[PDB]
Design a protein around this ligand. Structure first.
Ligand SMILES: [Cu+2]
Ligand SMILES: [Cu+2]
Length: 128
């Protein structure tokens, strides 16, 4: 079906998407993240990180503790299914991941790991 989704992260700490459906027929799925805001990534950086709805918290928590030079992601964190890099105003990045890394029924969450963002900047992702 549509094996890609274009997402925007802004200065109001908002993603322009709250729900992502991944068609079971896609071998791969792509997320195209952009930043229409004016703020640099050190103050309003945004990334799109995917994990099971259950692993979100620890990923966010350890991510904030890792620092900007690590894209607010704990190094080698196995809970991260896929992730774009952290971007600031005017920047863009895409991530493509194997659909086979996802399974039906299980609920997934996509979110930004920049400190405090995940409270507003998060969403749902399901394999349908
Ligand atoms: Cu298609
Ligand atoms: Cu963010």
């Amino acid at each position: 079906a549509e094996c890609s989704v274009d997402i925007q992260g802004n200065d109001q700490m908002q993603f322009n998407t709250n729900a992502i459906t991944v068609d079971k027929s896609c071998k791969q799925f792509t997320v195209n993240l952009s930043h229409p805001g004016n703020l640099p990534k050190n103050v309003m950086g945004h990334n799109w990180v995917l994990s099971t709805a259950a692993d979100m918290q620890g990923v966010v928590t350890d991510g904030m503790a890792s620092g900007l030079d690590k894209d607010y992601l704990k190094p080698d964190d196995s809970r991260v299914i896929a992730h774009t890099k952290l971007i600031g105003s005017g920047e863009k990045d895409s991530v493509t991941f194997d659909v086979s890394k996802l399974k039906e029924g299980e609920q997934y969450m996509f979110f930004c790991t920049f400190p405090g963002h995940s409270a507003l900047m998060k969403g749902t992702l399901t394999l349908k």
